[PDB]
Structure formats: C-alpha cells, structure tokens
Amino acid sequence: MKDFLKYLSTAPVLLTAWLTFTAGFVIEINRFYPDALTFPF
Amino acid sequence: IQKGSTVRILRKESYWYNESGTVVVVDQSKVRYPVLVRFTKVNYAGTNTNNFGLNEVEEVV
Amino acid sequence: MSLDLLPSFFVPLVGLVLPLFSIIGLFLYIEKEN
Amino acid sequence: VIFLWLSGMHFHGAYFSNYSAWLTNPTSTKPSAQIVWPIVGQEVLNADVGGNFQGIQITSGFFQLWRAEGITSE
Amino acid sequence: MIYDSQVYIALVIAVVASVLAIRLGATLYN
Amino acid sequence: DIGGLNPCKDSEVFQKRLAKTVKKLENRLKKYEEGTPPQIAIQQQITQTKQRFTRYADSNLLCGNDGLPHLITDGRWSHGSEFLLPSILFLYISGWIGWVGRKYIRTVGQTSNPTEKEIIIDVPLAISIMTSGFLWPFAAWQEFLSGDLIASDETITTSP
Amino acid sequence: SHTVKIYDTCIGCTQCVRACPTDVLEMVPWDGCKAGQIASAPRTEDCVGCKRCETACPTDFLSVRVYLGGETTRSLGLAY
Amino acid sequence: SIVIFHFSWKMQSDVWGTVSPTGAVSHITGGNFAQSSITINGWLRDFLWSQAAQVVQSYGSSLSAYGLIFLGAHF
Amino acid sequence: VYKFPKFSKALAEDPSTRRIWYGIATAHDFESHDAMTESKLYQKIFASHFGHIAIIFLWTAGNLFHVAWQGNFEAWILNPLKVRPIAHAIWDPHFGQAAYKAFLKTSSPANLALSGVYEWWYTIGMRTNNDLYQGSFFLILLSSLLLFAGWLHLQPSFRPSLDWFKANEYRLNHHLSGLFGVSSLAWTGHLVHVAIPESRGIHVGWDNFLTVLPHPEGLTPFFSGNWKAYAQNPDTASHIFGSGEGSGTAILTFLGGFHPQTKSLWLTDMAHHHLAIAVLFIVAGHMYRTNWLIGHQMKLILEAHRPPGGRLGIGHIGLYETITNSLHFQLGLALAALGVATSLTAQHMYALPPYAFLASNFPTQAALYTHHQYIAGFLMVGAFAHGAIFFVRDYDPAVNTRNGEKNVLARMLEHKEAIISHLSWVSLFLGFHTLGIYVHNDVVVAFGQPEKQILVEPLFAEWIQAASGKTLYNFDLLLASSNSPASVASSQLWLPGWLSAINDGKNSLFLPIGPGDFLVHHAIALGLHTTTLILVKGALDARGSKLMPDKKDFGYSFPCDGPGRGGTCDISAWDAFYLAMFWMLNTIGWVTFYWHWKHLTLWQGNQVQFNESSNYIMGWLRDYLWLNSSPLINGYNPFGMNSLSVWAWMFLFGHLVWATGFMFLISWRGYWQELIETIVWAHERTPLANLVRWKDKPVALSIVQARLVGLAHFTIGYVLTYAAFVIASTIGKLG
Ligand code: CLA
Ligand code: CLA
Ligand code: CLA
Ligand code: CLA
Ligand code: CLA
Ligand SMILES: CC1=C(/C=C/C(C)=C/C=C/C(C)=C/C=C/C=C(C)/C=C/C=C(C)/C=C/C2=C(C)CCCC2(C)C)C(C)(C)CCC1
Ligand code: SF4
C-alpha cells in the first residue's frame, strides 16, 4: 500500500475525489436549505 | 563565468531571455558562442540547453 | 419606344452581354505573355 | 464494462421502473426505468409515464425485450 | 413620370461619365 | 421603490404566480392514488414551492412587473444580502483557492523534481497548505509588503 | 523560389542537411564553431518550403531560416 | 444526419399515426413528406421548424431536460 | 501566364492558378508593388480616392434616378403612413405568373425600399419626381468632375509631391474649416431656404430662391444682432408637415423632442444644429499654422506633451514623424473614428429619428440599424488590422525612442503582456459570469420555477435615464426633478420638448430597460472585449513573440512558421484579424438581435414578452428566432408564395454560403492538393479531352487564401441570412 497511496495521489484521482466531495457538499447544502436566492442573513 | 555559474540571458530572440541558467562549459577556443547554458524550462522545441556568446550572458551575483 | 421597354432592353443586355465580353477581355488579359 | 452496464440496466428495471405496470398495460403505459432525485427542482423530470409511476421515459426498448424474453416479474 | 427626353439625356450624360471613368482607369495603368 | 420596483410581499403578480404553480401541482396530484409515493413527492413539491414563495416575500426582495425577484446590486447595504454578502463569501473562498494553489506551486517549485509533484500531488504538503488558506487576506497583505508577492525583471519578455 | 539563410549560431550538427527532402542544404567548412562546419543553401531553387530544415534545428531561435517567396513548379511540389 | 432526418420525417408523415375504427389512417404530420420534402425550404420549415416546436416549448414540463440538452448541444 | 500581375514580377512567374488568385488580392497593396516609390504611392492613392468618390456619387445618383423613374415617391408624399416606398422595378425572365403577381406594385413588379431614402429626401424638401431627377443629373455631373480630377492629378505637371501630401497643418485647417464647417454652413443654408418652407407648403426651387425670403425679416436680424427674431413663432403642435396649416416663421429654434405629427426632430432644430456646428468647425479650422505666421506646429505640441513626474516615458516626441510617414497609422485612426461615428449614427437614428415618418417605417428602421452596426464592426476590425499592419511594416523603434527611454507608443510594446493578460481576464470574467447567469436562468425556468431566476436591475443605466428626465424609475435625480439646477437652467429652452419625448411609451428615445437589458449589455461588453483582445493581441504581437521572435521579418500576412516548435498555425497578425472577424460578427449579431427583438416587442406591444423571456437563452431561441421566422420561411410553400419569397430564398442562400465557408475553414490544404493532382491525371489521361490543356497549372488555394475565402463565405452568408430574417420578420409580423 505504498504505491497504491501514491497512485491515489495522482492528479486525476485527486481531482475526481475533490470534485466529488465539492459537488457533494454543494448538493447537500442545496438539499437542506433549498431555493436560496439571497444570503440567509 | 565558468562551469556551474549562474547567468542571465541577454539574447532577445531567446526562449530564456531575462531568465537564469547554469553554465555547463565555457569554450576557450575561438568559437563565436562559447558559453553553453543549461536551463530547467524546455523551450518550444523541447531543448533545454543552448550556446550563448560572452556578451549575451550576465552572471548573477 | 416607351420607357417601360427599357428594362427588357437593358437587363438582358447588361446581365448577359456584359459578362460575356468582360470574360473574354479578362481571360485574354490574364492569359497574355511577354 | 459491457456486463456491468447490462447489470445496471436490469437493476434499474428491477428497482426503479414501472415494468410490472407496463406488463399489464403495454399500449397505455410509457416505459420508465430511471427516477430522478428531488434536488434543485429537477424532480419535474419525473414524468407521468403511467402506472402510478414517476420517472424518465425510456426509449431503449428494454421493456419490450424483457417481455419477449418472458420476464414477467421484477 | 419623367419623359423619354429626361431619361435619354441622363443616359447620354452617364455615357460621358463612363468615358471619363475608363480614362481614369487606363491612367491608373494596366 | 428603487428603480420603480415594488416589494414582492405586495406584488399581486407574485401571488398569481404562486397560485398558478400550486394549482398546476395540485392538478398533477389529482391523477395519482392515495398515499402513494408519487402523491407524497407532489405534496413535497407543493410544500417547497409555498415555502420558497413565502421566504422570497419576506426577504426585502423587490419584484418587477413580471412578479419575479429583482436584484439590487448598486452597492446599497439595504439589499446587501443579494450581491454584497455573497460577493464577500466568494471572494474569501476564491482567494483561499488561489492562495493555496500559489503556495503549493511555490513550495514544490524549490524541490528536485518540481514537475513530478504537479501530476502526483504531495498530499501531506497539499493538506498542510490547503488548511492554511483561511488567513489568505492576511498572508497576501504580509507578502506584498515584503516584496515576495511580485516578480520584477526575471520575467521573460518577447522580442519587441 | 524561397529564400534560405544560415546564421552564425550554427553549431554544425548536420540535422538540417539530413532532413532536407530536396537536397537544398549542405555542410561546408567553417571556423566559427567546435564542429568546424556550417550549413549552406546553394540550391535554393529546389527549396520547397516544407521547413523540415528548421524543425531539426537545435539552436535556440534557429540557425537556418526559410523565407517563403515567389512560387515555382519546383517550389510548389508539382509533379504535373 | 440526413439518413436519420429522412427516417424520422418519412415515418412520421407516411407510416406512423392512428387508425380510425372505420379504417381511416391519419398520420402524425399528415403526409407532408411527399410534397414538401423536395425543397430545402421544405426541410427547413415543415420538418426542422415544425417539429422543433416541442423542444422549444418543453420548458416547465417533464421534457425540459430535452430543451436544456438542445441548448447545451448547440453551445 | 504573364502580364496579369503587372505590379508583381514574382507572381507573374508563377506557373499555377495561384498567380491569378494572388493578382486580385494584392492589386490594392500598392506599397508591395514592383518598382515602387513613395511619390507614386501617394499619387495613386489620391487618384483612387477620386475614383472612389465618383463611384459613391454615381451610386447615389442611381438611387435617385430609380426612385424618380420606377418609384412611387409622389404618391408616398400624399400618404406616407400607408403607401409603401418602392425602390426600383423588377424585370427577371425567370419569374412565373405567380411571382409577377405577388411582386406586382402599381404598374410593374418592384422592390420595396428599405433604405429610408424616401423619408430622407422628403425631409430635406423634395416633393416631385423631377426634383429627384435633378439630383441624379447633378450627381452624375459631380462624378464626372471627380473622374476628371482623378485623371488630371496623374498628369505630369499636376502630380502632387510628398511635401504637399504630408502637409498636415494645411490639410487639417482646410478639412476642418472648409469641409466640415462650410459644408455645415451650406447645409444650413439649404435646410432653411428650401427645407423649412417646403415643410410649410411653400415651394423654394431653383427659380424662386433669390426672391423668396427664408425669414420675413430677411437677414436684418442677423446683421442687427437681434438673432432671437429667427426663433420667434416656431411651428405649432398642430402643424401638418409639407403644408402651411399650423406652421410658423422661425428658422432656428430650440424645441427638443420630436415633431408631434412626423415623430421626428424639428427641421428648425436641425438647421440651428448645423449652423452651430458650422461656426464651431470654421473657428476650429484656424488652429494650425500656415503661411501667415500664426497657428500651431503639431510637432511642437506633440513633443511638449510629456508629464513632468514621468509616467508616459518621454511623451509624444516621436509621434509626428511616425504618423506622417505611415499611411497605415492614419488609415487605422480614420477607420476607428469612422466606426465610432457610424455606431453613433445607428444608436441615434433610432432613438432620435431625424426624418419625417421614419419612426413608423419599422422594416427600414431595422434595416438601417443593422446595416450601420455591421458597417461599424467592419470599420473597427479594419482599424485594428491596419494598426497591426503599421506595427509590422511602418513602425520604427528608433524614431519612438530617445536615449533608451521610449515614447508613448513604444511603451505599449513593453507592457503588451500586461495589456493582453488583462484583456483576457476581462473577457474570461464577462464570459464566465454572463454565461453562468444565462444558463442558471435557463435551468431554473426549465424546471418550472422562474421565481429563482437571477435578475439584476440595471440601476446604473436607469440612473442615466433618470438623469436625462425619465420619470419611470422614481429616482428624482437631475432632470426627473423640477428643483435641480439642471432643470431650472433649461426650463425655458428645450426641456418641455425633451421631457415630452423622453417620457413617452411610443418612442424609442431611452427605451425602458430591465434585467434582460442588463444581461444582454453584459454579453455585448464580453463580445467587445474579446474582439478587442484578439485584435490588440495581433497588433502588439505582430512584430514578434516567444514562438516567433522574428515575425516582423515575415510580413503582416504569411501562412505559418511550420510544424516545428510545437506547431505555428495562425501565427501571423493577419490570422488575428481573421479570427477577430468571427468575434466581430458574433458581437454585431448579439447587438442586432437585442435591438431587433426589443423593437419587435415594442412595435407589436408585447414588451412583456421580451422583459420575461430575454433573461434566458431558450427565451431568445423560442420567442425571437423560432417565433418570428414563421413569416419568412412561408415566403413560398407547396401551396403558393408571397412577396417575401425572395427573402426566404436569400435565407437559404445565406445558410448555404455559411456552410461553404465552413468547408473552407475546417478542411485545410494538402487534402485538396492531392485530389487536384488526381483530377489532373484524369484530365491528362483521357481521350477527346487531351486536346484541351490548361495554361496555368491547377493547384489548391493557399492557406491564407483559403482562410480568406472561408471568412468571406462565412461573412456573406451571415449578413445575407440575417438581413433576410430581420426584413422578412418585420414585414410579415407588423403587417
Ligand atoms: C451605381 C448605380 C446604379 C445601380 C446599382 C443601378 C442598378 C440597376 N439599374 Mg440603373 N441607372 C443608373 C444607376 C444605377 N443603376 C443611372 C445613373 C442611370 C441613368 C443613366 C440608370 C439607368 C437605368 C435604366 C434605363 C435601366 C437601369 C436598370 C437597372 C437594373 C438592371 C441593371 C441594368 O440594366 O443596368 C443598366 C444601367 C444603365 C444603362 C445605366 C448605367 C448605370 C450607371 C451609370 C453605371 C454605374 C457603374 C458603377 C458605379 C460601377 C460599374 C462596375 C463595372 C465596372 C462592372 C439595376 C437594378 C434597368 C431596370 O430598371 O431594369 C428593371 C433599366 O432598364 N438603369
Ligand atoms: C442578368 C442575368 C440573366 C438574365 C437576363 C437571364 C435571362 C434568361 N435566362 Mg438565365 N441564368 C442566369 C442569368 C441570367 N439569365 C444565371 C446567372 C444562371 C445560373 C444561376 C441562369 C440560369 C438559367 C437557366 C437554367 C435557364 C435560364 C433561362 C433564361 C431565359 C428565361 C426563360 C425564358 O422564358 O426564355 C426562353 C428562352 C428563349 C425563347 C431563347 C433564349 C435563348 C438566348 C438566351 C437568346 C439570346 C439571343 C442572342 C442575342 C443570340 C446571339 C446570336 C446568335 C444567333 C449567333 C432568359 C433568356 C432559361 C432558358 O430559356 O434557357 C435557355 C433556363 O432554362 N437561365
Ligand atoms: C490555482 C492556482 C492559480 C492561481 C493563483 C491563478 C491566478 C491567476 N490566473 Mg490562472 N489558471 C490556473 C490556476 C491558477 N490561476 C489553472 C489551473 C488554469 C488552467 C485552466 C489557469 C488559466 C488561466 C487563464 C487562461 C487566465 C488565468 C488568469 C489568472 C490571473 C487572474 C485571475 C483569473 O482570471 O483566474 C483565472 C482562473 C481560471 C481560469 C480557473 C482556474 C482553474 C482552477 C480553479 C484553478 C486550479 C486549482 C488547483 C488545482 C488547486 C491545486 C492546489 C492544491 C494542490 C494545493 C491570476 C494571476 C488570467 C490572467 O492572465 O489575468 C491576469 C487568464 O487570462 N489563468
Ligand atoms: C476647403 C478645402 C478643402 C476641401 C473641401 C477638401 C475636401 C476633401 N479632400 Mg482635401 N485637401 C485640401 C483642402 C480641401 N479638401 C488641402 C489644402 C490639401 C493639401 C494640404 C488637401 C489634401 C487632400 C488629400 C491628400 C486628400 C484630400 C481628400 C479630400 C476629400 C475627402 C473624402 C471626402 O469626400 O470626404 C467627405 C467628407 C465629408 C463631407 C464630411 C465627413 C463627415 C464626418 C464623417 C462626420 C463627423 C461628425 C462628428 C465629428 C462625428 C463624431 C461625433 C462627435 C460627438 C465626436 C474631400 C472631398 C482625400 C480624397 O478623397 O481625395 C479625392 C485625399 O486623399 N484632400
Ligand atoms: C477605407 C478603408 C480601407 C482601405 C483604404 C484599405 C486598404 C488596404 N487594406 Mg484594408 N481593411 C479595411 C478597410 C480598408 N482597407 C477593413 C474595414 C478591414 C476589415 C474587414 C480591412 C482588412 C484588411 C486586411 C486583413 C488586409 C487589408 C489590406 C489592405 C491593403 C491592400 C488591400 C488589398 O489587397 O485588397 C485586396 C482586395 C480584395 C481581396 C477583394 C476582397 C473583396 C471581398 C471578399 C468582398 C467581395 C465579395 C462581395 C461582397 C460579393 C457579394 C456576394 C453576393 C453573393 C452577395 C490596402 C492598403 C491587406 C494588406 O496587405 O495591407 C497592407 C491585408 O492583409 N485590409
Ligand atoms: C492598434 C493600433 C492602432 C489602432 C487603435 C484603435 C483602433 C483604437 C481604437 C480606439 C477607440 C475606438 C477608442 C474609443 C474611444 C472612445 C472614447 C475615448 C469616448 C469618450 C467619451 C466620452 C469622454 C464621453 C463623455 C460624456 C459622457 C459619458 C456623458 C455625455 C457627455 C460627455 C461628453 C461628457 C493605431 C492605428 C492607432 C496605431 C497602431 C496601434
Ligand atoms: S524547405 Fe527547409 S527543408 Fe525543405 S528544402 Fe528548403 S530547406 Fe531543405
């Protein structure tokens, strides 16, 4: 698991993981607080 | 300048103009461009070294 | 000859004869030698 | 990869489809095998395909192929 | 409605402007 | 008010839009049966539509003649939650991203193989730099003061 | 015919001459570089302008330069 | 693209449709392929413009994704 | 195979068809011709200018003659709001009986006039088909004058020298004062003498003009200084144009706004405008020094303008010799000024219609705006292209540099990377966010929830509208307020006319704007910035870059530098123009789409359709293009045809030319040379055709020529299809 972790450190895998996480928290914010046109405050 | 010295390229038509390179060897013969400089950035043709004249390189302090 | 016959006299004249003579002249000119 | 794709198609037919309703009314129920999650207002994509079902109408003809195979259950 | 004389002389004057145009065209050389 | 607009809480066309959307959703709801998941989904759609319209009404939002919320982005703090606060939020987040990217580029630019560490990210160092971007406004106005933010004449220039 | 010029940045590596498809360039004696040779263009009437010569040039901004000019049946590569 | 356009228009105009109980055949478009598919203006108007009505009027309906993909594919 | 490119021996020796193609495309590049001097260059340009002005005057004379002969100008005078103007008659042997019947207007098939010449000539005081004939006769005489002058100034004793051509001060004094001021003075004279009484029913022709006083007092107030007398008793609010009912006696007034009947600017307003412009330009034409010891030497003015602290380098010291010795710098400046001027014409002739009954001529309004905006884009691209040409072939760094320090122009090549980088940043910013908001609106509306749209009220632009007096946005700012000093100052001069026009829903003066206007203006800004980025990058990078640090040695237009160094496709400055032409066409398309849709909704009355559907892309596609294309495509159907049949044919023709451009742009050379070789073999190896052989060897079009041909097809198809669409849609929708 020394080269597998290095493989997971490559640009495509890291970008895919980061974009999946990013889309995930964006989608979940929009699920829990939907239809947010202005700042909540 | 000598082998291993750091110089700034003063040739305007150069992919490494205003950049710093490492002198590989300064020829002592009567050639026109004796200074051979190696760079970290490859040019558009893929090469990373070029021969420069004595007045086209400026040593970095 | 009325004024309304002028279109039928001129439109064929211009739009067909002038191309023919212009093509003849231009082809002759551009195919010349020295 | 092809086998995984086919397995996904059959799984969607089994779980997220109105295949059972379409079997009893092939001429009046539109085949649907993909339901859409209710996010950012995209749930409008779940169409009135019939058979007490909401989803995207399927144009790949899997329902007809499954019926021709004799598959009568999910 | 303009007459035949009006159109005819305008055509004649247009011809004169044409001969002046080729003279300028030929003077600007081949 | 501003620009001839009126608050959406007193905009008749806004309420007409809400009523028409609710009526369409209820008409769609009529063609399903009992407490079946389709009816539950349509009821959730109706509830969310009502909640969204109510929130937009009670939001200091100005509606035009079409009954849609218009954004007042001239800079006034009265309508500051429409553009200004999201603007600050995005500026913070994007400055964070740019700062951590620049810091990673400059950090692995002083190693033996700078190009290798760009396709194969040093995840420990990347994580170290990324969580340090919360001070990007302060770090930027501490590196600009020291002259470490801008290059001067080592930058390359074309022939003319 | 196209114009081909050689500049004293030539290092005499011969890669231009052995890349010319129409035998335009040749290596001639010189005393301005270590190899003691410089490229020459004595048969530019056969130059086609394909610029393979300067694709093989290792010097920084080239030592062989091809300037396209008047066209000829030889320079246009016309077999007809 | 030309092949699939020919198939779509010909089928909609001269095969597909409904049959009345007395045996009268009414097609989706109404047999306009025979007389209006012989000019490029016919293809532009009676096929592209005419059958693109459903795509452009899909907003707000369950087919709105098709309009969005229409626009995105144009882009 | 010889003697055609007389100006180029290099081309005349080409054994291929490329010689003919390049002979056409290099005929006007006089600086590149064989045996070329500067004196011959300026003399040939001078003669070509004369021939060009003659061509323009002949074109105007032809328009006048064809309106006088085959038009319905006289009938249109008596009923300008119902009679449709006729451009010229049609005689086409290919017409069927149906086409003849549909195009039949009065006595012969004819084309409606969309140039607005009827309204323009009616406004300036033309009421007879014999007035138009006189104008055509006079313009042909003027064309003959200009042709004679062009011939004369190539004669040995009448050819001007370089000093005369480069005499900047004399030419500026004369151009400004004489041309602008005196032409404005003469136009004011005509306006008053002829146009003002003709709008009041009094005929002032070439017979009773020395005896019909333009004003009852008759030049007495002018010399006496009682200039207010020319403004007393203006035209009333019940004046019928062309008739004495409700008319006045004033000739120079401030009224502001529009005529209550013609919905156009007051003739007395325009006469006063031209008189003021004439006085100002005649005054300004005395600035520069001539043979009488007073005036300015512009070399000294340019050299003395260096900021003392020092931020522009050495200033403008080398600019005088730079501009004087370069014809491409001057051409670029002139083209930029002309582009801005014609953009101004387009933007003002719809908001402030100057001709009687032109506001109600919707097809001609749309045609005029589209024509002038396209000409504006062309002129701007030409200005930038000639700036790039100046950089390539006329710029001298030594002249623009004094002791190492660089002047104001040479410093533009030092921070060229900064300029290009910031243009790129602005373009990316605007594109990203305009497209993001548009796609957000698309998705949100498509999902059936239009309330979640992002709609930004254009408060900055609405602020400007309120500043000019529009009381629609409740700003109460400068002229929307009756107590502000801006309003009290002109409350007695031109506000009552101006306010009555700006605060009117039927005008195009300061059209009401909403979020759709905001988004489309940002799209327009993105288009302008991207076109500017391409053109500025090509101009600054014309002399060289990192990929080609000797680009100036290859000229303005060359195909490439080869596949080496990674590939150098489209690396020349000409290629930057070629790429920016697409962006200019796209930007002008956006501008004209916005204008036409806004005005179609305004004229039809459904302005709510634009205000709601213009915020998302599908709204545009469905409600502008798909909706208004219905009348156009039904110009001919399997059932019949209409007078709009020609517009549908032009629509399809434009699409075809566009796609042929796509041919010439996507498929490059090399693929067409081998095919041509196969065709050559086939011709050479076939009997009964071996008897015929070519003189020029057939070869594929060159890379640059192919780019030009594809661009020409793209542009011609673009222009033709949009002209057909706009005209046919306006005609078929608004009756
Ligand atoms: C540039 C101006 C211009 C243009 C574009 C047209 C266009 C047209 N004219 Mg026309 N015309 C013009 C000026 C013009 N006219 C003038 C000034 C006169 C007065 C002599 C006439 C008298 C005239 C008559 C009597 C008739 C036309 C007709 C026509 C139509 C068919 C073409 C034809 O037969 O031409 C014939 C044109 C002439 C005999 C006159 C010469 C035209 C001008 C003087 C030459 C302009 C040359 C131009 C600037 C550049 C030339 C390019 C060349 C080197 C290739 C066409 C719409 C016909 C028509 O109405 O059909 C329906 C027709 O019967 N014209
Ligand atoms: C201004 C341009 C112009 C004009 C005036 C015409 C005029 C004409 N075209 Mg034409 N055409 C043009 C451009 C033009 N074309 C172009 C650019 C194209 C290609 C897109 C075509 C393609 C085209 C086709 C495909 C056809 C025509 C036809 C015709 C004729 C109309 C049909 C008819 O009733 O006549 C009936 C014709 C006759 C009764 C006999 C006419 C024969 C010639 C023209 C008479 C010339 C007399 C001449 C002075 C004789 C010289 C002396 C000689 C005996 C030695 C008419 C002569 C039709 C036609 O008649 O074909 C011949 C036809 O089929 N055209
Ligand atoms: C993450 C580091 C980073 C930083 C600090 C910048 C900073 C800048 N870029 Mg830039 N850029 C980046 C990445 C970055 N860029 C990448 C990856 C690309 C390739 C798509 C570009 C492409 C690009 C262009 C084409 C242009 C700029 C421009 C600019 C300048 C103006 C800001 C702008 O327009 O943003 C531009 C930003 C984008 C187009 C999107 C960037 C894509 C993502 C968000 C960045 C990558 C994140 C990265 C993976 C994080 C990894 C770090 C982690 C491992 C620790 C500014 C100097 C402009 C300029 O010169 O103006 C002066 C300009 O024209 N950049
Ligand atoms: C009073 C004397 C006089 C007059 C009337 C002219 C007139 C002319 N000269 Mg000329 N010239 C003169 C003296 C004069 N010159 C002298 C003394 C010299 C020697 C020093 C020259 C040397 C000279 C050369 C070398 C050339 C000319 C040319 C021309 C012609 C320009 C083309 C044209 O028709 O423009 C017509 C233009 C107008 C009628 C006015 C244009 C209106 C503009 C576009 C509107 C601007 C309004 C406003 C500013 C817009 C901006 C909005 C604002 C808010 C900023 C024009 C006929 C050129 C030509 O074509 O030769 C034949 C040419 O090449 N001249
Ligand atoms: C008054 C303005 C003006 C003037 C004096 C010039 C003058 C000049 N330009 Mg220039 N230019 C202008 C405006 C102007 N241009 C504009 C507005 C643009 C932007 C479009 C350009 C773009 C431009 C480029 C890119 C280049 C020039 C070049 C030149 C020089 C040589 C011109 C040449 O060889 O012509 C050749 C003429 C042709 C090839 C004829 C082209 C005709 C086109 C394709 C239209 C014809 C199709 C027609 C519409 C048919 C209709 C189709 C029908 C079915 C409807 C010359 C000094 C060239 C140069 O080397 O400069 C030093 C050069 O490379 N110019
Ligand atoms: C490349 C080049 C070139 C070209 C350039 C160009 C093409 C440019 C353009 C330019 C432009 C195109 C510019 C524009 C400008 C504009 C302006 C500058 C404007 C201004 C305005 C104003 C200032 C206004 C003001 C006002 C207002 C706003 C309100 C009302 C009143 C008043 C008036 C106050 C040349 C050849 C030269 C040379 C070489 C280089
Ligand atoms: S072009 Fe370059 S390669 Fe081809 S012949 Fe001339 S020199 Fe040799």
PDB file of C-alpha atoms in Angstrom, chain B residues 9 11 13-16 27 30-34 43 45 47 49-52, chain G residues 7-11 30-35 54-55 57-62:
ATOM      1  CA  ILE B   9      20.373  35.516 -20.827  1.00  0.00           C
ATOM      2  CA  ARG B  11      19.749  37.499 -26.125  1.00  0.00           C
ATOM      3  CA  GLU B  13      15.410  36.148 -29.542  1.00  0.00           C
ATOM      4  CA  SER B  14      15.706  33.540 -26.796  1.00  0.00           C
ATOM      5  CA  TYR B  15      13.157  31.353 -25.042  1.00  0.00           C
ATOM      6  CA  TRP B  16      15.177  32.053 -21.877  1.00  0.00           C
ATOM      7  CA  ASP B  27      34.859  27.068 -24.520  1.00  0.00           C
ATOM      8  CA  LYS B  30      37.915  30.959 -30.967  1.00  0.00           C
ATOM      9  CA  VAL B  31      34.264  29.967 -31.395  1.00  0.00           C
ATOM     10  CA  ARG B  32      31.629  32.677 -31.714  1.00  0.00           C
ATOM     11  CA  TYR B  33      29.280  31.392 -28.975  1.00  0.00           C
ATOM     12  CA  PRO B  34      31.407  29.564 -26.389  1.00  0.00           C
ATOM     13  CA  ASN B  43      11.808  25.699 -24.994  1.00  0.00           C
ATOM     14  CA  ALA B  45      11.276  22.728 -29.474  1.00  0.00           C
ATOM     15  CA  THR B  47      15.558  21.522 -25.862  1.00  0.00           C
ATOM     16  CA  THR B  49      20.345  23.976 -23.480  1.00  0.00           C
ATOM     17  CA  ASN B  50      21.897  26.480 -25.863  1.00  0.00           C
ATOM     18  CA  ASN B  51      25.216  28.102 -26.742  1.00  0.00           C
ATOM     19  CA  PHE B  52      25.496  31.817 -25.967  1.00  0.00           C
TER      20      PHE B  52
ATOM     21  CA  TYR G   7      23.160  32.327 -39.237  1.00  0.00           C
ATOM     22  CA  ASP G   8      26.417  32.066 -37.303  1.00  0.00           C
ATOM     23  CA  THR G   9      24.576  30.450 -34.371  1.00  0.00           C
ATOM     24  CA  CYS G  10      25.049  27.255 -36.419  1.00  0.00           C
ATOM     25  CA  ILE G  11      26.668  24.516 -34.347  1.00  0.00           C
ATOM     26  CA  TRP G  30      33.823  26.836 -41.131  1.00  0.00           C
ATOM     27  CA  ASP G  31      35.802  28.108 -38.146  1.00  0.00           C
ATOM     28  CA  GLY G  32      33.023  29.615 -36.016  1.00  0.00           C
ATOM     29  CA  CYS G  33      32.059  26.510 -34.031  1.00  0.00           C
ATOM     30  CA  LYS G  34      33.517  23.377 -32.472  1.00  0.00           C
ATOM     31  CA  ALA G  35      32.455  21.099 -35.331  1.00  0.00           C
ATOM     32  CA  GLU G  54      14.337  24.258 -39.146  1.00  0.00           C
ATOM     33  CA  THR G  55      12.281  21.594 -37.376  1.00  0.00           C
ATOM     34  CA  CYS G  57      17.494  22.852 -35.724  1.00  0.00           C
ATOM     35  CA  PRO G  58      18.623  22.583 -32.072  1.00  0.00           C
ATOM     36  CA  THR G  59      19.893  26.158 -31.700  1.00  0.00           C
ATOM     37  CA  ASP G  60      17.746  28.484 -29.633  1.00  0.00           C
ATOM     38  CA  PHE G  61      15.933  30.507 -32.255  1.00  0.00           C
ATOM     39  CA  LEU G  62      17.163  28.553 -35.271  1.00  0.00           C
TER      40      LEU G  62
END
